[model samples]
Target: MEGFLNRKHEWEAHNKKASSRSWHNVYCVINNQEMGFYKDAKSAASGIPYHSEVPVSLKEAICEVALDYKKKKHVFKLRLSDGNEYLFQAKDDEEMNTWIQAISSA
Candidate 1:
């Protein structure tokens, strides 16, 4: 699946690399091999630069966030083996659940 979404990273001891802890709206693409992030939705059509990417297999868990209320909702977290957790927020509940399932079974 390919679409626009907001994502962020949370620090964890086992995380292989350091990443920003703020939300970024970008184009996200998910395939059998890896999940790719682009600069924007339009940039996805033609680009040599990808914001980042992670192997689909690296995702050990996926679940919707129920903690934060006001500023964060319709969000889910991807837990990788390296303890690199990615928070993804969709436009709405339907969209959020869709991503959760897609990534969970990917």
Candidate 2:
């Protein structure tokens, strides 16, 4: 991931289904501030933030990205330090692979 510093990447996740088996979007990002997530990507500056370096909450850029299957959803986990894991579902195999690449290389 050399030279990947400062590059921005956004991906989506789902909240506990509000109704009968439905889902919604919650965007996550990796950028200037170690790493963070957004309930909506539009604001860019909102949502929970995670540290990714020394002197800053022991910052940990994505530790690993592993493909997973959960809740009938074909998804993956961005395993960050301190065991902060994020689950995201890509449309299909292709999208999943792309996500792996984006996060791994970001």
Candidate 3:
């Protein structure tokens, strides 16, 4: 699955500690056993380089919806097997549901 999603950094994997971070809108790509992100959709055309990537073994990683009523956005969570947790904001609930299904199924 690939598209634009708003992402924010949370606690590092296995850190058991907190870090200051914020959200960013970027283009993401998921294939095989890895996931990658670009600064934005426009930057993806040239394929300069990915901002970052992390291993996301869907078979072991946990995926779930984490809606925030106050934020009024469609949110979901990705808890990687390595202990890294991410909060992602979908464009809408439809996209959110679609993403969950896509990531959940192998």
Candidate 4:
């Protein structure tokens, strides 16, 4: 009695976060979507993976995205439509851009 209309909807996974950074190239795929870190690679390199996720519904509503050289030379920020901010970083500037564009155009 607790199913049908309460079931999840289907949406094609578009943003892969492929160019996204991690601890020694580490990553996780949950429900066909890639998730990344909040801290940095040091967490993953230690065998204890640390990261978080943003709902797939928020992907297209990412209204503000930015990069910073201060945090780790490739820090990325995602400010969503609901005023929630998500942070992560890249291994380099180019990779950061890949994430930036992917999130922006979504």
* Candidate of highest lDDT: 3
Provide the TM-score for each candidate, comma-separated: 0.72, 0.47, 0.77, 0.41
Instruction: Write candidate 2's Cα lDDT for 2-106 as tens digits.
Output: 121111113313334222333434444555435443444543444343323221221444633334544424465555554333455655666666656655554
Per-residue error for 66 in candidate 3, Å, reads 1.6
Residues 1-106, model 3: lDDT tens digits: 7799987767653455346457877787665655667765566655646554433445566887778735746888787676677788898889999888777765
lDDT of each: 0.67, 0.42, 0.70, 0.38
Ranking of models by lDDT? 3, 1, 2, 4
Candidate 4 error regions (>4 Å): 1-56, 63-71
TM-score of 3: 0.77
Over 17-78, each residue of candidate 4 has an lDDT whose tens digit, in order, gives 43333322224211222333323344434545342332223444442333543444565555
Which pairs of residues have clashing backbones in candidate 2?
51-59, 52-59, 52-60, 53-59
Candidate 2 wrong stretches, greater than 4 Å: 1-24, 45-71
**C-alpha-based local distance difference test score of model 3:** 0.70
Local lDDT at 1 for model 1: 78
How does model 2 fare in lDDT? 0.42
Error of 1 at 97 (Å): 0.8
Candidate with more favorable, higher lDDT: 2 or 4:
2
For model 1, the stretches where C-alpha displacement exceeds 4 angstroms are 12-19, 52-61, 67-70
Q: Which ten residues in a row have the lowest lDDT in candidate 3?
A: 50-59
